[PDB]
Amino acid sequence: SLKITDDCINCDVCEPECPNGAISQGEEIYVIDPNLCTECVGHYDEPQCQQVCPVDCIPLDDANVESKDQLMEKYRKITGK
Ligand code: SF4
Ligand code: SF4
């Protein structure tokens, strides 16, 4: 999964970009739900949130390291596809 760091400026532009609805506004910064973040695999070749973030604060989550096979399995479960 990806995660949103403390550098987030609460600009909102990533939230509508997520195909799985994984992003929401938290108490201090935006937050990714790791159960819905596929790192966009199955939808886009690259994470869509990273492409619009103005401060590049959406890195890989070190606490949630996943393979392409794992992410694609998550995509199938979320989408039924
Ligand atoms: S990487 Fe893709 S699935 Fe994960 S939060 Fe960003 S837009 Fe959503
Ligand atoms: S696009 Fe980047 S700075 Fe803007 S709300 Fe999302 S994570 Fe925060």
TrEMBL record:
CC per GO annotation: cytoplasm
Pfam family, one: Fer4_7
Binding site for [4Fe-4S] cluster 2: 18, 37, 40, 49
Keywords from the UniProt entry: 4Fe-4S, Electron transport, Iron, Iron-sulfur, Metal-binding, Repeat, Transport
Superkingdom as given in the UniProt entry: Bacteria
Record keyword Electron transport present: yes
Residues the entry annotates as binding [4Fe-4S] cluster 1: 8, 11, 14, 53
InterPro entries linked to this entry: 4Fe4S_Fe-S-bd, 4Fe4S_Fe_S_CS, PSI_iron-sulfur_center, YfhL-like
Domain 4Fe-4S ferredoxin-type: 1-28, 30-63
Keyword GTP-binding: no
Protein name: Ferredoxin (4Fe-4S)
